[PDB]
Amino acid sequence: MDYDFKVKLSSERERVEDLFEYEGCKVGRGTYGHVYKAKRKDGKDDKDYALKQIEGTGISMSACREIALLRELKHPNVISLQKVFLSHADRKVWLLFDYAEHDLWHIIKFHRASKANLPRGMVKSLLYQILDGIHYLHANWVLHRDLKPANILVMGEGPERGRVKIADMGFARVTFWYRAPELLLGARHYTKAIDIWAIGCIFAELLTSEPIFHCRQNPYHHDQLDRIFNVMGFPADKDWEDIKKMPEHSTLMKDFRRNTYTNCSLIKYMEKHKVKPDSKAFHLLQKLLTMDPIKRITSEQAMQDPYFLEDPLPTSDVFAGCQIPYPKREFLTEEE
Amino acid sequence: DKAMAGNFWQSSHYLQWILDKQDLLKERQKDLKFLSEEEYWKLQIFFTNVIQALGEHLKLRQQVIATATVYFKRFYARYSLKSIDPVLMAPTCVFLASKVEEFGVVSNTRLIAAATSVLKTRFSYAFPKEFPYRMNHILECEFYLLELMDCCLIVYHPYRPLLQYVQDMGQEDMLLPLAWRIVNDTYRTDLCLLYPPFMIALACLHVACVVQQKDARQWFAELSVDMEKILEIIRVILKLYEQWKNFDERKEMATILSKMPKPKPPP
Numbered sequence: 001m002d003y004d005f006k007v008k009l010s011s012e013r014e015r016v017e018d019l020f021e022y023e024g025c026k027v028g029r030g031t032y033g034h035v036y037k038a039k040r041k042d043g044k045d046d047k048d049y050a051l052k053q054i055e056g057t058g059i060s061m062s063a064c065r066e067i068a069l070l071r072e073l074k075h076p077n078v079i080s081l082q083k084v085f086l087s088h089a090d091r092k093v094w095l096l097f098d099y100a101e102h103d104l105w106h107i108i109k110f111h112r113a114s115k116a117n118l119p120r121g122m123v124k125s126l127l128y129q130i131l132d133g134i135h136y137l138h139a140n141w142v143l144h145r146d147l148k149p150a151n152i153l154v155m156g157e158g159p160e161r162g163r164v165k166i167a168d169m170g171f172a173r174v175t176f177w178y179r180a181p182e183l184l185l186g187a188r189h190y191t192k193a194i195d196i197w198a199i200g201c202i203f204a205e206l207l208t209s210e211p212i213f214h215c216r217q218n219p220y221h222h223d224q225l226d227r228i229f230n231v232m233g234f235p236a237d238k239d240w241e242d243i244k245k246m247p248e249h250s251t252l253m254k255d256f257r258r259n260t261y262t263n264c265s266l267i268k269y270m271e272k273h274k275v276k277p278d279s280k281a282f283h284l285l286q287k288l289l290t291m292d293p294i295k296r297i298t299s300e301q302a303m304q305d306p307y308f309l310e311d312p313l314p315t316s317d318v319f320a321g322c323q324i325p326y327p328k329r330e331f332l333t334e335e336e
Numbered sequence: 337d338k339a340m341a342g343n344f345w346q347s348s349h350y351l352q353w354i355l356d357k358q359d360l361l362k363e364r365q366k367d368l369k370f371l372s373e374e375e376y377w378k379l380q381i382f383f384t385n386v387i388q389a390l391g392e393h394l395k396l397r398q399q400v401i402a403t404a405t406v407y408f409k410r411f412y413a414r415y416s417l418k419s420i421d422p423v424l425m426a427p428t429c430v431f432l433a434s435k436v437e438e439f440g441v442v443s444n445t446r447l448i449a450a451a452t453s454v455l456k457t458r459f460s461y462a463f464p465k466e467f468p469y470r471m472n473h474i475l476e477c478e479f480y481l482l483e484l485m486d487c488c489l490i491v492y493h494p495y496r497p498l499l500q501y502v503q504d505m506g507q508e509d510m511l512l513p514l515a516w517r518i519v520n521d522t523y524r525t526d527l528c529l530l531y532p533p534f535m536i537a538l539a540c541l542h543v544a545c546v547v548q549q550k551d552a553r554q555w556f557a558e559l560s561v562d563m564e565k566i567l568e569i570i571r572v573i574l575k576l577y578e579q580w581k582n583f584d585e586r587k588e589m590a591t592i593l594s595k596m597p598k599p600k601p602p603p
């Protein structure tokens with residue numbers, strides 16, 4: 001390697017530790033890696049930034065996908081990659097995003113925790129922006145492939161107050177509460193329909209503060225399927241005609257009898273959680289949570305649902321100017 | 337699987353990596369002290385064939401090979417041949433391309449064995465000594481490649497628009513094999529840095545029609561496209577086949593490689 005080329009680049013290369021203060025500012029740990037709430041050292045602005053140190057050294061498959069896709073994608077409801085740092089000493093990759101104080105996991109947890117002692121307008125506005133973000137991705141042939149409350153961010157106080165940001169574009173290809181039944185019966189490819197089922201599960205959870213297909217923690221998963229049928233009922237032959245083509249169908253026939261779920265339907269489940277089966281919300285929910293993936297509503301069709309024309313209309317700030325009661329992110333002082 | 341299909345006009349490919357011809361020629365002048373314009377083009381044809389061979393060995397799809405070829409071209413579009421060894425850059429580009437295209441992470445043993453084997457079995461005329469690099473060198477080079485491309489990893493190619501055009505002609509069986517093959521050959525040139533891939537496809541399809549003596553003038557007339565730009569591309573393709581005729585890669589490349597500018601070593 002040419003020496004002058006090498007030192008020229010070493011001189012000019014911006015290093016993450018010189019540009020950003022983030023020591024002791026870790027807000028999350030997971031398979032994604034390490035996320036920090038960071039500020040600029042050369043204080044041109046006073047904005048909060050999210051800095052993610054990716055899992056492992058070098059460029060993983062997961063990291064390649066997120067970097068590749070977020071470099072291209074631009075939409076108000078998809079998180080924006082601001083910068084990439086490549087640290088040559090330790091071979092660590094850093095990704096810079098704008099900082100989201102909240103997400104659906106924590107918003108949902110706040111309301112579920114209150115049940116020992118969500119506004120409906122916020123529920124509609126959240127759903128609309130999720131669909132809008134996912135429609136944009138689907139229009140560009142990008143599947144998220146693991147949508148859940150934990151990776152649907154919501155901006156806190158600032159110029160983007162209450163704006164949804166879909167995050168985590170690293171799913172390159174445990175609990176299965178958001179996984180569509182075709183995956184559980186051995187579907188070989190990810191699809192757009194699979195993302196829409198997940199949005200269905202998320203919407204049910206926004207309405208009840210409860211994970212609809214909650215289950216105790218080889219694509220065939222008996223207990224997860226059992227929970228889905230206890231909520232939805234067991235699918236009729238005409239409801240899902242291509243179920244026979246699924247690799248795990250004989251196992252399903254072996255382990256399950258339709259008669260076990262005779263009194264089970266989404267109507268009766270949602271009736272227990274005080275959601276009206278006559279509501280436009282319920283009818284939209286039911287179309288998202290259709291068992292046969294080819295009979296599932298698309299993102300664009302869901303966005304055109306009369307639910308979103310009904311009062312109250314979805315707002316761009318999901319909190320609608322009202323005071324944010326959800327706490328700020330705590331810093332993690334755990335060793336590991 | 338079809339990620340970012342239809343987004344070209346809003347893409348980093350279009351916005352950052354469709355370069356100006358005179359700018360590209362200006363940055364090339366530092367290497368043109370050491371090599372002629374002819375020798376530089378021959379050298380780029382050579383490394384296109386090296387990347388092709390590497391990808392065939394690793395049993396990769398053509399899109400992965402195409403993407404790795406573009407990565408390589410973009411690097412030396414901006415930097416000198418002395419900056420990093422193209423013998424090292426070629427497998428590094430293939431390595432990064434297979435990740436980006438979701439083919440997989442090629443293993444340490446498989447990638448180095450592929451580079452060693454291909455250069456021994458297929459390019460002994462150009463390379464007397466064995467592949468000197470190890471996996472630590474590939475990973476180091478991957479950081480430089482990623483930095484220089486400004487993390488622009490999604491690349492568009494003429495194959496998808498070409499397939500769409502021949503299906504729209506209803507002439508898939510007759511025209512596709514030759515047109516596809518002419519698209520492969522355009523990677524011997526700078527065309528991928530200078531033109532939208534759909535225009536490269538139409539020029540390759542046009543040359544295939546002329547070769548096979550198929551009348552398609554009405555179909556081409558009905559297109560909404562600047563035909564002077566297509567004719568510019570056609571001239572480069574015809575010029576490519578004349579250089580091909582007059583170029584013996586096997587007889588010439590050892591001497592051309594010896595003439596490449598060498599890296600400055602450390603103190």
Ligand SMILES: Cc1n[nH]c2ncc(C(=O)N3CCC[C@H]3c3ccc(Cl)cc3)cc12
Binds near residue numbers: 052098151153
């Ligand atoms: C926080 C925050 N703000 N802006 C962001 N952009 C991207 C990401 C992120 O990479 N991910 C990956 C997994 C789901 C999300 C995330 C969310 C919350 C936390 Cl504690 C850690 C990580 C986080 C933030």
